[PDB]
Amino acid sequence: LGIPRYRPDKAETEPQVGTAQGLAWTPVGGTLLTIEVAAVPGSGKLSLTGQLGEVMKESAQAALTYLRAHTQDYGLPEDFYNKVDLHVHVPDGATPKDGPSAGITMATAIASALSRRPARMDIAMTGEVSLRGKVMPIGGVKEKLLAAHQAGIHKIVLPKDNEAQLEELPKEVLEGLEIKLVEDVGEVLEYLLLPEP
Amino acid sequence: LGIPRYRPDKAETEPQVGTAQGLAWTPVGGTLLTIEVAAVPGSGKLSLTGQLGEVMKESAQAALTYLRAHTQ
Amino acid sequence: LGIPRYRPDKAETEPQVGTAQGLAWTPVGGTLLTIEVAAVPGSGKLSLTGQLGEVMKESAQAALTYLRAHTQ
């Protein structure tokens, strides 16, 4: 053949401070959306980057204010939203799936960049947030799971609101992929971000 | 069929700490509005951000006046 | 031949302050898009000049985000 351009797993990618490989309903093929953002201790100012829209802004603010409600959970300083330069990028357009289907992905990415703490790859995730952070069931988690095994990713974060559909998931998928089981966002951020400490 | 999508209904759907469902005849014409609180211990402010026209701002401010009048 | 239509060598072409050698692959030939930006005290508004599109502006802000990480 030629020279390898990809990796057997994204542990070779060596977990990055920006994003952990947010799964996607990318219709040409479920990407691992490294929805990277801007963050440094500083002013505190929200904006957009990367041809984004406001659905993504309201989900970003909803996650960011869950973090504001869960400041003590992730090592965030007593004021961080009004102390960090917020400039949010999405690689794939405004949103590949219309709606913030990958909402907990940039929730984690925001939390990661605010904490300056790498969110680990070889574990990918998907899910929507309320601003209370009750993780609503996104539509068809089989998509993001099939994408996750298509990138070799085996641990997947999914809601207790989607543990209902977790057992409907196909057999080859069910044992190739175990599924991390969450109901809220604090345990997403403790499953995925074990390298937050 | 597939599994139950929503949880068992609101006689036993546990009462939410924050979200008050409410009535609205939007383009869907019938829903339950989900209303948050960004209760961060911080500066202390109020803005009705999110997809809100100013008449919703007025209604919230108006019964908000009742709440601030009946706060204790 | 005649008068040399270009320089004798691109080994020295007066290294300027703000010249950025653009190694694009154009349709007809391979060019050096020697684009320029000049620094000035201003207002923070990133000026979308010189026919910028959708990804160029956010690439510029991607640059300034990295620069904001690495101002020193």
Q: CA of C30, closest CA in chain A: separation in Å?
A: 25
Residues 6+ apart with CB under 8 A from A74: A67, A111, A114, A115, A117, A189, A193, A196
Q: CA of A36, closest CA in chain C: separation in Å?
A: 10
Pick among A35, A51, A88 to test the C interface (most C CBs inside 10 A): A51
- Estimate the share of chain A in helix, then strand, then coil, as percent rounded to the nearest 5: 30, 15, 55
- The structure's method of determination equals cryo-EM
For A32, the 3-state DSSP assignment is strand
Binding residues of A for Mg(2+): 23, 101, 126
Please tell me what resolution, in angstroms, this structure has.
3.7
Structure tokens given for B8: 């068992």
Neighbours of A194 (CB within 10 A): 12
Q: In chain C, what is the greatest distance between 2 CA atoms, to the nearest angstrom?
A: 52
- With vertex at residue A93, the alpha carbon angle to CA A88 and CA A95, rounded to the nearest 5 degrees, is 80
d(CA A133, CA A107): 10
d(CA C20, CA C34): 5
